[PDB]
Amino acid sequence: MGPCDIYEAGDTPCVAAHSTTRALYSSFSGALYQLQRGSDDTTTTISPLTAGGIADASAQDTFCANTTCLITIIYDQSGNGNHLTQAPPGGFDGPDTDGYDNLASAIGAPVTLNGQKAYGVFMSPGTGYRNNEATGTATGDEAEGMYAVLDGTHYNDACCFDYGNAETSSTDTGAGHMEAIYLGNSTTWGYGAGDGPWIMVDMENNLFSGADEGYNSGDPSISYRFVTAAVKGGADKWAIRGANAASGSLSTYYSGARPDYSGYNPMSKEGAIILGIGGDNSNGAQGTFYEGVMTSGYPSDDTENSVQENIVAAKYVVGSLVSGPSFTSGEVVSLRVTTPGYTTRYIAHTDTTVNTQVVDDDSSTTLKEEASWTVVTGLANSQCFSFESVDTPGSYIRHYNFELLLNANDGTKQFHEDATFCPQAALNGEGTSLRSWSYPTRYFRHYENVLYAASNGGVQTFDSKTSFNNDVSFEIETAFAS
Numbered sequence: 001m002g003p004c005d006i007y008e009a010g011d012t013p014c015v016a017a018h019s020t021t022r023a024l025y026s027s028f029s030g031a032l033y034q035l036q037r038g039s040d041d042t043t044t045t046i047s048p049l050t051a052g053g054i055a056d057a058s059a060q061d062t063f064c065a066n067t068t069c070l071i072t073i074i075y076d077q078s079g080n081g082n083h084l085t086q087a088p089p090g091g092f093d094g095p096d097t098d099g100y101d102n103l104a105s106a107i108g109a110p111v112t113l114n115g116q117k118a119y120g121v122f123m124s125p126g127t128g129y130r131n132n133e134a135t136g137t138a139t140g141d142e143a144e145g146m147y148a149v150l151d152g153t154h155y156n157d158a159c160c161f162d163y164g165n166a167e168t169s170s171t172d173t174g175a176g177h178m179e180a181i182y183l184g185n186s187t188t189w190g191y192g193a194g195d196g197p198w199i200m201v202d203m204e205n206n207l208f209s210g211a212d213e214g215y216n217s218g219d220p221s222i223s224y225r226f227v228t229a230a231v232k233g234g235a236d237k238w239a240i241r242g243a244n245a246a247s248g249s250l251s252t253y254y255s256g257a258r259p260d261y262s263g264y265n266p267m268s269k270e271g272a273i274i275l276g277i278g279g280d281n282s283n284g285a286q287g288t289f290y291e292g293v294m295t296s297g298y299p300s301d302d303t304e305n306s307v308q309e310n311i312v313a314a315k316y317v318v319g320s321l322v323s324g325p326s327f328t329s330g331e332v333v334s335l336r337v338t339t340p341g342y343t344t345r346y347i348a349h350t351d352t353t354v355n356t357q358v359v360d361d362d363s364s365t366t367l368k369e370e371a372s373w374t375v376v377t378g379l380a381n382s383q384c385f386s387f388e389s390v391d392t393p394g395s396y397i398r399h400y401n402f403e404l405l406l407n408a409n410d411g412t413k414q415f416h417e418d419a420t421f422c423p424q425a426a427l428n429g430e431g432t433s434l435r436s437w438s439y440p441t442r443y444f445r446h447y448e449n450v451l452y453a454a455s456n457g458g459v460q461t462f463d464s465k466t467s468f469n470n471d472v473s474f475e476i477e478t479a480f481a482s
């Protein structure tokens with residue numbers, strides 16, 4: 001039995017089931033999600049290896065070789081056709097073309113389920129999926145349940161990393177017009193105990209951690225690498241239950257009446273489905289989605305417990321984020337450009353501007369150091385790395401507005417994430433391609449001799465597809481600064 005088989009057995013069937021890692025029905029063998037590669041913009045789908053099995057990761061690896069991939073669609077496994085596609089603009093515009101939100105990279109969240117490789121949906125700020133014409137989802141004050149397996153270490157405090165029921169117009173139509181899971185450490189509305197993140201319920205114009213607007217001591221911080229967030233809502237009742245998706249049971253953080261404020265009872269749910277964004281399309285949040293569903297009816301705690309047991313049984317384990325050459329902490333290197341006509345240039349910097357410059361043995365000691373980098377354990381992820389300037393110790397290469405800059409480490413999470421890059425076998429086959437950890441659709445990329453965190457095609461001029469593969473491939477050589 002899969003999660004939806006369990007929910008069905010409890011008389012509160014899935015009306016929407018999404019996952020890029022596995023089938024949520026023991027009998028599902030259809031498409032889990034769709035891919036699109038930057039090379040030729042063609043697409044393909046990824047299905048379970050076997051009915052009710054794990055996603056065929058190899059099929060994706062094959063399709064995305066020597067290029068970049070985006071997850072265009074996360075299919076609804078229930079049969080209701082509630083597929084999630086690129087979120088459109090609404091109260092707020094997304095950063096993509098015509099106000100749409102970005103699609104997520106297909107390789108930002110590698111994992112293994114009971115030993116089998118799979119990919120989750122790593123969502124950076126500006127990313128979002130949605131379906132504004134879903135079927136079977138609860139509307140009005142109708143009861144519903146939902147859960148999602150997320151990454152408790154990947155989040156932020158901006159609105160809003162959600163998964164659940166939302167407005168069909170992508171606008172904030174008022175209190176009670178939403179009901180979705182939220183995971184992050186936003187304190188703009190509600191918030192729990194500690195430093196966060198907290199699993200809360202977005203009911204529109206409020207993220208609730210409990211009965212009162214704002215602070216609620218009953219909602220603990222939950223930062224497990226894999227978090228099971230289970231939320232449900234019915235006639236003047238709702239609950240928050242959380243757990244380590246890798247082990248143990250669900251704990252109830254809240255169970256009771258609707259917050260006693262106008263508009264929350266009865267609810268006015270609209271039935272749309274959102275992922276990684278807010279109801280009005282607020283798109284500043286980040287997070288990772290592995291699997292999740294929405295149901296019809298209020299799930300009993302027993303049913304959810306069985307679901308949690310199934311998720312634990314799935315044995316989620318973090319996958320490798322690195323491929324190709326790679327480095328060792330403390331190693332000093334120089335990175336050479338492999339793009340024809342610029343092969344004598346190296347990644348260097350002039351003050352805070354990271355760029356490429358012709359560097360050779362006749363270069364000054366200062367320029368040699370400016371083109372030399374001390375590789376250290378990734379500031380935001382120990383699997384990846386951060387690049388510290390040799391001439392300016394304490395400063396690292398970090399992206400800011402997608403431009404690579406050399407700034408001093410201020411010790412903040414933001415800086416840490418902006419300065420973490422994951423090595424990937426060079427797309428052009430020559431050396432390495434440094435993929436941004438926080439924005440997996442972006443790579444170290446030189447454009448007109450300046451470094452950026454660029455995507456294979458995009459709204460910025462430096463995201464040009466022209467010479468992308470070459471512009472993101474660098475040869476690792478001995479540092480000039482020795």
Ligand SMILES: *[C@@H]1O[C@H](CO)[C@@H](O[C@@H]2O[C@H](CO)[C@@H](O)[C@H](O)[C@H]2NC(C)=O)[C@H](O)[C@H]1NC(C)=O
Nearest residue numbers: 156157185186187188195196411412413414415
């Ligand atoms: C959510 O959590 C992060 C991480 O603990 C908080 O970020 C810090 O941000 C403040 C405000 O800029 C800085 O003084 C600290 O130096 C940061 N600490 C770290 C460890 O990065 C963030 O403020 C929290 N958000 C809210 C709304 O409370």
Ligand SMILES: OC[C@@H]1O[C@@H](O)[C@H](O)[C@H]1O
Nearest residue numbers: 160204205206278279280
């Ligand atoms: O309720 C929290 C957020 O506030 C509104 O702006 C968004 O639609 C919603 O997700």
Ligand SMILES: OC[C@@H]1O[C@@H](O)[C@H](O)[C@H]1O
Nearest residue numbers: 399400401402403414418
């Ligand atoms: O580079 C993209 C974003 O721009 C800046 O606002 C942030 O520091 C960074 O994460």
Ligand SMILES: OC[C@@H]1O[C@@H](O)[C@H](O)[C@H]1O
Nearest residue numbers: 339446447448449450467
């Ligand atoms: O960075 C130098 C060149 O400038 C641009 O024309 C290309 O993207 C790049 O190869």
